Amino acid sequence: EWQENKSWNAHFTEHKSQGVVVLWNENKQQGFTNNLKRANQAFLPASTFKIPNSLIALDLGVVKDEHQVFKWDGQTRDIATWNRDHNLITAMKYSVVPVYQEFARQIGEARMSKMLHAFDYGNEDISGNVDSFWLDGGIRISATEQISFLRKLYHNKLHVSERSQRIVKQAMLTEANGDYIIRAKTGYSTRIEPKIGWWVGWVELDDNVWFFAMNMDMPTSDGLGLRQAITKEVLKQEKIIP
Numbered sequence: 001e002w003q004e005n006k007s008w009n010a011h012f013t014e015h016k017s018q019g020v021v022v023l024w025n026e027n028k029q030q031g032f033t034n035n036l037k038r039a040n041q042a043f044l045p046a047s048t049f050k051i052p053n054s055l056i057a058l059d060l061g062v063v064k065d066e067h068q069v070f071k072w073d074g075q076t077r078d079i080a081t082w083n084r085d086h087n088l089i090t091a092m093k094y095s096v097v098p099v100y101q102e103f104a105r106q107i108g109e110a111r112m113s114k115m116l117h118a119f120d121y122g123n124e125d126i127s128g129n130v131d132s133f134w135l136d137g138g139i140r141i142s143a144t145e146q147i148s149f150l151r152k153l154y155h156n157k158l159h160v161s162e163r164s165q166r167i168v169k170q171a172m173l174t175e176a177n178g179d180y181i182i183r184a185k186t187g188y189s190t191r192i193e194p195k196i197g198w199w200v201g202w203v204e205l206d207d208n209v210w211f212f213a214m215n216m217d218m219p220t221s222d223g224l225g226l227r228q229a230i231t232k233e234v235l236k237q238e239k240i241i242p
């Protein structure tokens with residue numbers, strides 16, 4: 001069962017923005033969104049792909065564990081935090097594309113393709129360059145499809161080891177306090193129109209979990225903070241977080 005709540009559009013309108021928020025209540029098995037159509041429109045996953053990419057790299061042994069150091073290749077890039085060593089935790093925290101490009105190269109087209117199909121991940125199409133297809137290739141995923149994937153991850157139901165899923169869920173840790181835990185991943189798609197920002201993950205409460213997946217128009221990097229800000233305003237409105 002799905003319910004459309006156009007009142008959430010105000011949270012996008014307030015910022016001269018457009019986008020979709022999709023919530024899934026795990027206890028009630030009920031979904032909520034401001035825009036049923038855009039909830040089912042498929043976009044490039046951009047850095048939200050680091051979730052499946054991490055899972056595959058861990059399960060194949062490309063990544064030993066969350067402590068393995070991936071040394072900076074010495075090439076100065078424009079994102080300062082990319083010009084340093086990383087492990088899986090920090091590489092996910094700072095969306096370090098070059099680290100995950102090497103993961104994908106070592107995974108390879110064939111194993112990457114099989115795994116995304118095993119994950120039922122988006123359109124499961126890796127057409128393009130193996131080290132950038134999630135940024136400018138043929139792979140696409142919708143907000144509702146992000147949730148279906150994330151629900152499997154949360155329940156350790158993806159076709160990789162429990163350990164791989166636990167590790168990636170650790171790497172997804174974004175925020176935690178006495179009221180909730182957020183495990184999520186941001187995304188920023190600029191290479192193919194329309195330019196969008198992603199934020200997908202879930203909110204762990206004492207006796208329920210709310211999965212979420214949002215994307216929004218992102219003409220400039222100046223609005224990237226709106227991904228979390230808008231999502232949280234929706235969560236506050238639905239009394240999911242204080």
Ligand SMILES: CC(=O)NCCc1cccc(-c2cccc(C(=O)O)c2)c1
Nearest residue numbers: 047078079080095097186187188221224
């Ligand atoms: C230098 C600097 O901080 N520029 C402003 C911030 C910026 C510029 C260009 C690309 C990204 C980026 C790249 C991959 C993933 C993500 C994400 O938010 O998931 C974001 C961020």
